[PDB]
Structures are given as C-alpha cells and as structure tokens.
Amino acid sequence: MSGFDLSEVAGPVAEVIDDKNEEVEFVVFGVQTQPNKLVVDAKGKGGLEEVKAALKEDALQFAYYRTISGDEESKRVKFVFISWAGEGIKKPKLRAVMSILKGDVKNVINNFHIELHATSLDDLVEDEIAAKIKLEHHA
Ligand code: NA
C-alpha cells in the first residue's frame, strides 16, 4: 500500500532472527525518497542501546532487534519492533506516511513480541521494554 521499495528489509530481518547468525542482533532502517525506499542505516551486534545510537532526531526510521526474556529459565528470545519519527523531521508529508509505511514494513517484519512507536529517546528505555515483554509473555 505505501509505494515504498522494501527490498532491503527481509534480508536483515532474517539475520536478526537467525540464532546461528550471531553477527547480526539488530537492524535500523532509514527512509529515502525519490525513489521511495528503505535502506539499512545500521546493522550488527547489540540491542537497544545500539539502536538508540542510530536513531536521528530529524529522521523517520524503523528498528528491529533481538533480546532475551525469562525469570530466568526458560530464557527465551524475544523480538522488538520500533517505529521512529524524530521530533526534528522537517517535512510533515514524510510524517504522514508513517502509518501506511509501517503497515507495509510489518508485513515483512511479522515476528515481534512488542511494537513501540517513539519520537524521543526517552520513549525507549530498557527496563520499560523488558517489563512490557514480561507482561506480554504472561498474557
Ligand atoms: Na542473528
């Protein structure tokens, strides 16, 4: 529905999910226009902090990472999906595409335990997301 090229998405998503690809635990995607396409902004080892480091105040981005949840045993792998619309984005037409683009992205990034929308780094706090995961686990 969005008109964006998502060709770059599936590969790295599979990398994050793949337990045997230990070199990739997160990915951050950025958004290019004319032509409208997602690209990889960052990808590697790490989690939330690494994602946060890659999120830009003037950008529309998406992120996806793996984390562990458990009390402990059973420790289980959980996946976090974040949409990001920085408070510095200059074009309100780009802000407006967020939800339709997000929907297309979630059809590729279909395996997640929590979804968060953030506009500030304060929206993304490890303990808060861990507690949310622990909650969705026992629902
Ligand atoms: Na991986």
Residue numbers in the entry: 1 to 139
From the manuscript:
EhCoactosin, an actin-binding protein of the ADF/cofilin family, participates in actin dynamics, and here we report our studies of this protein using both structural and functional approaches. According to in vitro binding assays, full-length EhCoactosin binds both F- and G-actin. Instead of acting to depolymerize or severe F-actin, EhCoactosin directly stabilizes the polymer. When EhCoactosin was visualized in E. histolytica cells using either confocal imaging or total internal reflectance microscopy, it was found to colocalize with F-actin at phagocytic cups.
EhCoactosin consists of a central core of β-sheets surrounded by α-helices. This arrangement of secondary structural elements is a common structural feature of proteins belonging to the ADF/cofilin family. As described in more detail below, the surface of EhCoactosin is highly negatively charged, and this F-loop is part of the negatively charged surface. Although there is a general similarity of the overall conformation of EhCoactosin with that of related proteins in other organisms, the surface charge distributions of EhCoactosin is markedly distinctive. The N-terminal regions of the two proteins do deviate by up to 14.7 Å, with that of HCLP bent towards the inside of the structure while in EhCoactosin this N-terminal region is extended.
